Amino acid sequence: KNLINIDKPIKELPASIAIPKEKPLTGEQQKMYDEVLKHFSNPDLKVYTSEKNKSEDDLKPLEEEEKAWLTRECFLRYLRATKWVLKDCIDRITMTLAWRREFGISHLGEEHGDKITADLVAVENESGKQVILGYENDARPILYLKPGRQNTKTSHRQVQHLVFMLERVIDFMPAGQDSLALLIDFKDYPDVPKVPGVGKEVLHILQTHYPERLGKALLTNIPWLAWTFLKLIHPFIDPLTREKLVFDEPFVKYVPKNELDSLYGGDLKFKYNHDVYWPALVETAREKRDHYFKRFQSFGGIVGLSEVDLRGTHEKLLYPVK
Ligand SMILES: CCCCCCCC/C=C\CCCCCCCC(=O)O[C@H](COC(=O)CCCCCCCCCCCCCCCCC)COP(=O)(O)O[C@@H]1[C@H](O)[C@H](O)[C@@H](O)[C@H](O)[C@H]1O
Numbered sequence: 361k362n363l364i365n366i367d368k369p370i371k372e373l374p375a376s377i378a379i380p381k382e383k384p385l386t387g388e389q390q391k392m393y394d395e396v397l398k399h400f401s402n403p404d405l406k407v408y409t410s411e412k413n414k415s416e417d418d419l420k421p422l423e424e425e426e427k428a429w430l431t432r433e434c435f436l437r438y439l440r441a442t443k444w445v446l447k448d449c450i451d452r453i454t455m456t457l458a459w460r461r462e463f464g465i466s467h468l469g470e471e472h473g474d475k476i477t478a479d480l481v482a483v484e485n486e487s488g489k490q491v492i493l494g495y496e497n498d499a500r501p502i503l504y505l506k507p508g509r510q511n512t513k514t515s516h517r518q519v520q521h522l523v524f525m526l527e528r529v530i531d532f533m534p535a536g537q538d539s540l541a542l543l544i545d546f547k548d549y550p551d552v553p554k555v556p557g558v559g560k561e562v563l564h565i566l567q568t569h570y571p572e573r574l575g576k577a578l579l580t581n582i583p584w585l586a587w588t589f590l591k592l593i594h595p596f597i598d599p600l601t602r603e604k605l606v607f608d609e610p611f612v613k614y615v616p617k618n619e620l621d622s623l624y625g626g627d628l629k630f631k632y633n634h635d636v637y638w639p640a641l642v643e644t645a646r647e648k649r650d651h652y653f654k655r656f657q658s659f660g661g662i663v664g665l666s667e668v669d670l671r672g673t674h675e676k677l678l679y680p681v682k
Pocket residue numbers: 440441442505510518519522526542546562565566567568569570571572573574575577579582583586587590
């Protein structure tokens with residue numbers, strides 16, 4: 361049979377998958393990074409409390425949980441996304457801090473006060489339209505998107521759910537990796553009873569507040585018509601972006617068989633069971649956050665700590681702060 365029956369997220373990256381080595385920063389890159397570190401390490405720093413309602417008359421200092429989010433890799437994700445333009449990098453990080461506050465996810469978990477709770481969005485995942493399961497060849501956690509399993513009508517809660525799931529897959533990042541792999545299944549699922557500015561908001565969030573997170577996007581069951589249109593524009597897409605897109609290729613070339621859903625060629629026989637999968641996902645992510653924050657506090661609770669150190673168990677810091 362070779363099939364492995366599974367119904368819960370795989371908690372840890374298996375030892376069989378190596379963590380890609382990071383290329384050291386150049387002299388100039390290091391200098392600019394230190395400027396970002398200095399900016400956010402300023403004890404008198406105050407940031408907007410909202411993005412959509414930003415006001416110079418309403419600024420508040422960084423909370424403990426926000427300093428824990430402002431990691432070495434966070435700075436690097438924004439520096440790369442902004443093409444190493446200091447001004448733009450600082451402004452972008454600042455606005456994401458503001459948006460996280462406005463959206464209800466600035467506390468690194470409902471356990472610290474987040475308005476976006478698992479209970480608030482749980483109903484949105486009842487049909488398994490989004491699933492966090494497994495890791496691919498470069499240690500990236502996998503997030504499955506199955507739009508054909510839509511179970512709710514358009515609402516802001518749908519956006520809150522997408523953001524919550526994105527935050528959870530980030531919680532699943534193995535120490536040393538900070539990008540994810542998306543596996544999108546466009547197949548229509550007539551088993552999931554049909555129901556009975558969301559698109560613009562989702563677009564804004566994805567294009568503004570999650571820089572350098574897309575490692576790979578695996579597409580399958582692409583509508584015939586849709587496929588043709590993708591193939592027509594494909595030759596005109598930037599090389600770096602083209603390298604992120606995978607279609608018309610066996611998924612097993614990018615994901616270990618024992619880390620891939622059998623529906624797409626893998627050996628994992630996965631059947632979504634909300635009452636089993638959901639609580640497991642919530643608890644697994646919660647434990648990862650608890651560990652991450654405990655480490656953060658153990659290391660002084662300062663801005664600029666490395667996610668490699670926060671998500672690991674080693675005693676000595678691999679990236680001591682300047
Ligand atoms: C009900 C709920 C609805 C919720 C709404 C649901 C919407 C569902 C679909 C997709 C949403 C997916 C979100 C995935 C988020 C992952 C985290 C994330 O936000 O990644 C972001 C990117 O996310 C994505 O790219 C996901 C989209 C991949 C494209 C897939 C195309 C598929 C095309 C298929 C052909 C057409 C099929 C049509 C089928 C029609 C069927 C009827 C950030 O990008 P990244 O490259 O990491 O960093 C950027 C940075 O940001 C820029 O500033 C910089 O300038 C640039 O250089 C880079 O640094």
